[PDB]
Design a protein around this ligand. Structure first.
Ligand SMILES: NS(=O)(=O)c1nc2ccccc2[nH]1
Ligand SMILES: NS(=O)(=O)c1nc2ccccc2[nH]1
Ligand SMILES: NS(=O)(=O)c1nc2ccccc2[nH]1
Ligand SMILES: NS(=O)(=O)c1nc2ccccc2[nH]1
Lengths: 263, 265
């Protein structure tokens, strides 16, 4: 992988692996989300990091508030996918990381993704606005004119998501993370939550449809000793409303929506 | 990746990913096992497979793992390049063996080795059978004919008999179940998931103070998509050794048994 000519974005190519594909012999949405995360990490590394030196002193970190992914074509096993990523400052609200997925052979856009990030103290877990000091250190690595993976007005990446009401139409209960679900800092990897959301989608939908769009809001993290219930209700293509909550007290950890296209 | 000059083995390089590493910023044993599986798949593809031979597909026969043995001396760090060489060997009518050698691409030193025993099974009845001559002839042209062992040694750990853990277990992790990411393209539980489930009953204190050096796993029965598993461990022991058992949560039907050896950091 490498930074582009202007040094304001990063590209990397990936060969889709045998264990990364589902029943259709194409990459799962979890494989795609892991690849987006990997190219974001390589981008941060290439420009010197995604914590700045002043964030490290103040015990501040970037946390995902929302992830939105749209896939037109999932790459097949053995195919090469090229992913371009970049970051943008959204004033004192936080930052945004965007991605464009392309088929390396044709050059066509096969997918796009966007994510909203907020600044949090690692210890108290309290959200803070972005200070000028931190903003100035990040801006030299971002394009200053707008660059949006989802430019369109009233697009699906910025839609408000409601809270699923009991009883849910479908459910998968007692979900718990194992060591492979954790990142290097022993926190549950963000991609695991996408997997848990999808566990309450019936197998008949997965067998007859392809997932086209997924929007996920992250409210609270699942700890290593927590147990999660995944709830889904059809709102309609087929659209669903989703809710992840702790198995015991019913504390919300995530909410989202999915849109599926008939094969 | 590519077949070597003689066409009897296959090599591939991998850059260790951010999500593939544990707390030490080095690859997990599950990442290593996924990479071994990936290089085995690429080897089969390079020599014409899609690893079912012509006679196997008409007879509804497949290769299934009976045992997996992995020894790691050094886990590659995040961003490091690991080179893996793999090859197959016929073991007469018993079945086949796939071996691997892991190397640090910069130094060329051997950082790990693995071996696996495979048996022929009818896909539908699940009945094991010996390898026929017609099938054996079809895969011998892709294997070295003189012995080539990742584990040569006379009393090596890869061929040791594993006993059945007796109740009560010292440690346990109950109610483990697969999610869609744990399945392969054929909707069967991926073999690597079982390694993860075995490791779930190892205490976090062992994981924090030791590195896993050796793992031997016997596969007895598969976990179906609607099954629930209990992972059991008892210490059998500088180094710490454990005896492992995976069984179905309900009737206690054995699915796997194994051993692990851990060395103090
Ligand atoms: N909320 S989180 O993204 O799961 C998270 N919180 C964290 C605190 C310290 C270090 C890493 C963290 N990752
Ligand atoms: N973080 S976890 O993957 O949920 C986890 N923590 C563990 C501590 C001890 C034993 C098993 C464990 N599994
Ligand atoms: N026993 S197994 O390795 O989980 C397995 N059985 C199978 C039957 C048909 C197709 C793939 C399979 N994988
Ligand atoms: N155990 S699994 O094969 O990952 C799985 N999860 C499921 C959720 C809903 C319907 C069928 C499922 N199969």
């Amino acid at each position: 992988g490498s930074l582009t000519e202007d040094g304001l974005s990063y590209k990397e190519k990936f060969v889709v692996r045998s264990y990364e594909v589902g029943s259709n012999k194409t990459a799962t949405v979890e494989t795609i989300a892991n690849l987006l995360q990997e190219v974001g990490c390589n981008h941060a590394q290439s420009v010197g990091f995604a914590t700045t030196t002043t964030m490290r002193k103040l015990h501040l970190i970037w946390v995902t508030a929302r992830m939105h992914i749209e896939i037109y074509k999932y790459p097949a096993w053995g195919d090469v996918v090229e992913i371009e990523t970049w970051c943008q400052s959204e004033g004192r609200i936080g930052t945004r990381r965007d991605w464009i997925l392309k088929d390396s052979v044709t050059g066509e856009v096969t997918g796009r993704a966007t994510s909203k990030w907020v600044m949090m103290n690692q210890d108290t877990r309290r959200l803070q606005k972005v200070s000028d000091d931190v903003r100035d250190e990040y801006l030299v690595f971002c394009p200053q004119e707008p660059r949006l993976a989802f430019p369109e007005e009233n697009n699906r990446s910025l839609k408000k998501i409601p809270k699923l009401e009991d009883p849910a139409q479908y459910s998968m209960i007692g979900l718990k993370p194992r060591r492979a679900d954790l990142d290097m800092n022993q926190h549950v990897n963000n991609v695991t939550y996408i997997g848990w959301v999808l566990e309450s989608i019936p197998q008949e939908i997965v067998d007859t449809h392809e997932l086209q769009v997924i929007t996920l809001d992250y409210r609270r993290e699942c700890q290593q000793d927590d147990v999660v219930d995944s709830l889904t209700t059809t709102t309609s293509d087929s659209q669903f409303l989703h809710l992840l909550r702790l198995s015991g007290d019913g504390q919300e950890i995530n909410r989202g929506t999915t849109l599926w296209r008939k094969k």
